[PDB]
Design a protein around this nucleic acid. Structure first.
Ligand SMILES: C[C@@H]1CCO[C@H]2Cn3cc(C(=O)NCc4ccc(F)cc4F)c(=O)c(O)c3C(=O)N12
Ligand SMILES: C[C@@H]1CCO[C@H]2Cn3cc(C(=O)NCc4ccc(F)cc4F)c(=O)c(O)c3C(=O)N12
Ligand SMILES: [Mg+2]
Ligand SMILES: [Mg+2]
Ligand SMILES: [Mg+2]
Ligand SMILES: [Mg+2]
Ligand SMILES: [Zn+2]
Ligand SMILES: [Zn+2]
Lengths: 261, 66, 47, 237, 261, 47, 66, 237
DNA sequence: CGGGAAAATCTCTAGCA
DNA sequence: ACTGCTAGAGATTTTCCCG
DNA sequence: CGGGAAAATCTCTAGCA
DNA sequence: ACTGCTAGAGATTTTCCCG
């Protein structure tokens, strides 16, 4: 393909033909045509077609501001449950955000907050509020709303409910609180057919209960497990497989070639 | 004793996702809960799921239904 | 190693090549002309 | 299924409740509820004063968990907005107020009507004392009294472990509300099943308790009898 | 459910709870809860999750204008093949559009053009150009770009190529023509691994050839087919099934219970 | 018959109920207060 | 004669879509071509596809490959 | 597979080309090309004048199909832009111009270099006469001469059926370009296969012609021999 | 019949603005 | 009475090659 | 074991701006 | 070193009910 490869690079500098057009018009295997494409900086114009996945640990909250009828609505969602906390605030400032956040940390267990890079969220006063409450801050990649996908979707949902119940109130602050009520307790679905309020109660209750339970189990069940290695601590055994922890690496090895001591 | 505790742990359900599938995989069985990972049991199979991909509930409706 | 081409931060023009420093699920950390950037994998191409 | 008689004997000896009878002896909770059968939404409101400002404080009486904040003025509208917020954040069935003007206004009543809260006109006082004590401990860590009030609420709800099991008010309120959700779900199950009529082996009309996958539990003449599914014919009356 | 139904409508007027929340909180079968939702005008806020499909007959062209560096690029695509015709025009006016269109109709067989409702396309002069060339105009639903999906995607593709070859020219008009060349002849893919130029040649050649062929076949093969009815004209027979046309309704009835005369 | 609720023509507010006149694949023709509208089925709900 | 013509028609390929699937269904066999519809034959099966859902090519690469 | 000998006899009697031999006797076209073996990209350019304006006209000589338009001036840049447009719309390998200044400029040459067009310096004249005749017939249906020129181009390409088979220039050019695509594809197939070497039954090196699903066609000592796939070993030289 | 490697196919994304 | 699409990047599945 | 009807599940979209 | 999601509308598939 020596002749064909030189003609295809000359032609790609002019036209930037894709790998198929080169493979077809100059007798080249697909791998060589694809290599010619992959060597051109000018043809690197497309990302990989996937989506990541946001953190859904029990302690993560995604915060954002949204805007309606000229006012700023500060919205938080508990990622695991879909439970929202929202207030009309007078301006999009770090002072009101730090206050909202410190209230939230006093109301529910908050371990981590995840926001875009608006000035209210990156403010030093919000940083001092998080440091006092023990809240870790995580800032999304700039201008990637998909990273705040949960709270952005909650923005859409809260605005839809506000639009459904706007006529039952006068001030937007009241309609916002009504919509927070409606979302948290009057809409059921999701994983356990729950409402968001039921679901957050279940998530947090489960967190506390499992924490205590496994504390007691590990306090009682103390053994050492060899497989294939060293004294790997035992997590769980049953149904022909054993779960163990060898140097902070949890692996599921079958019962065969695994002994518990 | 320890058996009661282990069965109690095993009453909890786990919804989880895999690293490239956005569908939340249906209710699985909780075997172990750690700081960084939980060990589940989904359809005669033992997976290790990271905590950030795992929603753990008891589901009071099913608990009350028996 | 790896060549990384990326679109960052609202600029619809694609830049690169950059060096790959870290590869997570969903994001990469690249090093382009002494600048460390963090980019979603939807907005990068690793060669 | 076979431990039902054990549960009846346990209830006759010890008068245990349906939770223990359903967890120890493995029974669908409607069965244990039949054996045994044969607050979590109450909040206390009160305005308190400090540095010239009014602190509106809500107390979940069953847990000791606090929701407090500085309001601009002691009017009906401010109290009603606080109430809408509380109800949208927690299950609030009943509020216990003190006949004050704000707590009786037409707007607070309309908000309790919208949220479906019932209004009825000591713990609130002691909790206010605890709140003012924490507010005093942390007044210097803040400039405005509203920030200090929220700091104190945080300390009271999550940093003050007391009571029997050494829990915070937050853990307690989560446990109590989880129990109440279980209660509501069990009541829904009972209400569902209470409309069915059963005929088994064909004997008289019997009351349905459970339609399991391998058995059917019924209750005839105050006797809980387990029968197969083919041997019984469920209807709806 | 008489008691439960009255309480659920009272509650839905305030909160607009979804069908699950009502079914759960008031003992209602899902059909009754869903009916309460479906009777509220205020809860009809979502369309059906599908997409239509644009016409891809051999004679349809989708036209649109696009904008780059301050100039107006008029773009046409042949829907069946992906073949584009694009020119920088001095303004977005009906006069330049009628001229572009009449040229296109003289270059390729155009039966139908499909555009958005821009003023250039709805102009009377474009209408007179279509009437002289025998072109039927189809206007999409206003403000539904998905209806012009093919040409909008071609806009994206043409701008990407222009961006690849912009430095090889001076004036945007030249780079546009280069990009049209590159799209029509130097990029292969799609149904027959073709380029757009090859593909349009094949589509049109096939149209002409099949038209003549079936003309000759129907001219020769003349029969009448009864099944189950009347004298249904015969289209095709073979492999145990017969294809026939009974009152402009083409149905595939098996060989059994079908006789050809 | 049928109730049709729709979002038309860049107005994000949902209107209706209207009468259904024609139901194609991808679009419907509705009659709302003497006005004939044509709407994509992504932007309507037929009851 | 008529047999040659029919086999010629049957050399053409049809790409087509169904009324709710956006994937273009792979190369099928052309049996009849009308004004409003074409009759195809896709994997031992006779479908009737409307003209606006049907791309009919000969595919010269495959024709030359035999 | 079995009609190969019939094809050879037909080529000996009648000297038919590979198209008939491959369509009538059912042969992968590389086989017929071997039996037989043992313009469509040429355009004519020329500027013409009318009502004081210059009409640049391109003619695909094999079909008689026209691309004409009014240009502002007879310069290199205008001709080169017309050429880029033509080449992006059709497969243009060669253009036949008349040594005029516009047709020899550095810009037209650079555009032919970019598009990969070869330049070489009667039909054009007669076609211009036909174009001016149609332009005269339809000059009154338009105001500007550019619109009339495009109307005439339309009439010439699609409304003037002539020649043997009563076709228009558009049908003819589509047929000719389709034939040329078939030609290019057959040449690509031949170039692919021409690099292989075959050994069958083991005889000497033979030339590969087709790797069908049930047979393998080769050519040894000017004789086209069909053998099974297991009975032969293809390599690459 | 068995793997390996290469092709074909399928899945899924942004930008069209 | 009209209607999302296109092409590329990466993953997964089918096909072909020599044993 | 058989259909029917109801539930459960799956697929897929806009809006978040 | 971080990361699309949520809820509803309609379609399709599983489960349960009485024979
Ligand atoms: C000045 C701060 C910080 C820097 O960036 C800006 C601009 N911005 C833009 C959007 C937005 O484009 N939403 C539409 C959307 C698109 C895709 C998706 F996955 C989710 C979506 F919500 C926001 O929501 C938002 O909060 C902001 C904002 O706050 N800021
Ligand atoms: C004044 C004319 C007539 C009336 O409407 C306006 C405004 N408009 C808006 C877009 C646009 O929003 N493209 C983004 C996009 C979104 C979804 C999708 F499927 C395809 C897409 F291209 C156009 O492309 C466009 O040509 C126009 C236009 O021409 N007009
Ligand atoms: Mg924001
Ligand atoms: Mg936002
Ligand atoms: Mg437009
Ligand atoms: Mg457009
Ligand atoms: Zn390139
Ligand atoms: Zn409603």
């Amino acid at each position: 393909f020596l002749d064909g490869i030189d003609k295809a690079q000359e032609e790609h500098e002019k036209y930037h033909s894709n790998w198929r057009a080169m493979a077809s018009d100059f007798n080249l295997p697909p791998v060589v045509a694809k290599e010619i494409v992959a060597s051109c900086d000018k043809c690197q114009l497309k990302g990989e077609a996937m989506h990541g996945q946001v953190d859904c640990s029990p302690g993560i909250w995604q915060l954002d501001c949204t805007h309606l009828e000229g006012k700023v609505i500060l919205v938080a969602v508990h990622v695991a449950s879909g439970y929202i906390e929202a207030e009309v605030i007078p301006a999009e400032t770090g002072q009101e955000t730090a206050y909202f956040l410190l209230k939230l940390a006093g109301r529910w267990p908050v371990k981590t907050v995840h926001t875009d890079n608006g000035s209210n969220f990156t403010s030093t006063t919000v940083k001092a509020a998080c440091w006092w409450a023990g809240i870790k801050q995580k800032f999304a990649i700039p201008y990637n709303p998909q990273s705040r996908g949960v709270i952005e979707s909650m923005n859409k949902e809260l605005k839809k409910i506000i639009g459904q119940v706007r006529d039952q109130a006068e001030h937007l602050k009241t309609a916002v609180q009504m919509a927070v009520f409606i979302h948290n307790f009057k809409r059921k679905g999701g994983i356990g057919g729950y409402s968001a309020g039921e679901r957050i109660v279940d998530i947090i209750a489960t967190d506390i209960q499992t924490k205590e339970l496994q504390k007691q189990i590990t306090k009682i069940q103390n053994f050492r497990v060899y497989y294939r290695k060293g004294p790997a601590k035992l997590l769980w055994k049953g149904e022909g497989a054993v779960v163990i922890q060898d140097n902070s690496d949890i692996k599921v090895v079958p019962r065969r070639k695994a002994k518990i001591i | 004793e320890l058996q009661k505790q282990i069965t109690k742990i095993q009453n909890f359900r786990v919804y989880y996702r895999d690293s490239r599938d956005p569908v939340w995989k249906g209710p699985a069985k909780l075997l172990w809960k750690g700081e960084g990972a939980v060990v589940i049991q989904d359809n005669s199979d033992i997976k290790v799921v990271p905590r950030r991909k795992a929603k753990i509930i008891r589901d009071y409706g099913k608990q009350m239904a028996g | 190693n790896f060549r990384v081409y990326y679109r960052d931060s609202r600029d619809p023009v694609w830049k690169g090549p950059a060096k790959l420093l870290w590869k997570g699920e969903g994001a990469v950390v690249i090093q382009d002309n002494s600048d460390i950037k963090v980019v979603p994998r939807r907005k990068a191409k690793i060669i």
